[PDB]
Amino acid sequence: ENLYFQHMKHGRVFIIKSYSEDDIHRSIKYNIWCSTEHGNKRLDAAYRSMNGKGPVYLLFSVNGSGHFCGVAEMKSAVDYNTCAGVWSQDKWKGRFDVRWIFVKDVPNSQLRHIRLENNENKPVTNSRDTQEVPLEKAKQVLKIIASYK
Template sequence: MIGPVDFEKSVDYWQQDKWNGQFPVKWHTIKDVPNSQFRHIILENNDNKPVTNTRDTQEVKLEGIEMLKIFKNYDAETSILDDFGFYEEREKIIQERKARRQPSLPSTGE
């Protein structure tokens, strides 16, 4: 995160509109690392469950250092960016279908 949250801006990435705001980020590394690489890391503060069974905003203490090492050293050939074209096209189709289903408002003759 390289700047503050701007709550006046929003993005249409989410199925639900309950999240608003946007903030700038600078990505240093983008790559896919399978969950299997992290399952052995157990979080005491999450009922001793694997880190792969956590939710967003879960605190990861010193185990995070091991996760960063795994992430850094994993030799990945793909990233989420490879899939953006597919998801953007799919979202475009969904929005077009929604627009066709919405009934037109009757003209008031004015």
């Protein structure tokens, strides 16, 4: 058995959706990310209120890909004023640090039975960018990702 996540009360987990595989590769390479304005604000608020007493995890998936592609931890607050045009499209304003934990493809079939009570009970696999995941469901997703071979 694996009881590691048991007793973790302090943790917040978000879905990250990307239209670009290039941005995923760049994120892995340089340990940085950027979301939408409203996505950034959501993530920044979670990171800042965590106050270092627990992790903010990010579950990454490319739109239309059929799989999640990995997990990173948010590792800084959002800097809203940074170099433009670093990503595939020039829509993004700002940057924050991340540390990647899993770089592995996990099919949606492996995760589609976990549903989110805060998103109308929809499969976690039908989430939008910066959808937050309740902690108990997040623990379930993490364990499946970690154990997928």
